[PDB]
């Protein structure tokens, strides 16, 4: 009992420093978070593609083309962004 006590206490202290050192043992944790973020960043960036349209920001397309023409541009942008959302959701499901 005397030196099983010591060994225990000392070893706990070890765990402390070991972690503090810099092994981010919490790597298996960090990843998750980061992994998620990356997935978010892509989604956000995907708002700059025009998927074949003459431009990207809806406001413009609306602010340049008549409704009957708008139809085309708008629809294409819709399909593109819908696909981006779908991919994001499916990935989220898997990671879940």
């Amino acid at each position: 009992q005397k030196l099983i006590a010591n060994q225990f206490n000392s070893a706990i202290g070890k765990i402390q420093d070991s972690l503090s050192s810099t092994p981010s043992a919490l790597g298996k944790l960090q990843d998750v978070v980061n992994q998620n973020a990356q997935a978010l960043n892509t989604l956000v960036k995907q708002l700059s593609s025009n998927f074949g349209a003459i431009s990207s920001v809806l406001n413009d397309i609306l602010s340049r083309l008549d409704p009957p023409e708008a139809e085309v541009q708008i629809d294409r942008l819709i399909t593109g962004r819908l696909q981006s959302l779908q991919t994001y959701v499916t990935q989220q499901l898997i990671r879940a």
């Binding site: 972690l19 981010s24 043992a25 919490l26 944790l29 960090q30 978070v33 980061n34 998620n36 973020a37 978010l40 960043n41 989604l43 956000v44 708002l47």
Partner: protein
Amino acid sequence: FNKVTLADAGFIKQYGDCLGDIAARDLICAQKFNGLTVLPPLLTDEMI
């Protein structure tokens, strides 16, 4: 609690940066990231 950082995590960190605490009187940070929202967990850190 300090070895896990959010510094190089763009959207999550900058959404966590809607806590300017006075910096802008009217900051509805749910209307700044285009729908992308983050709900809070049912359990905080203190209760865990």
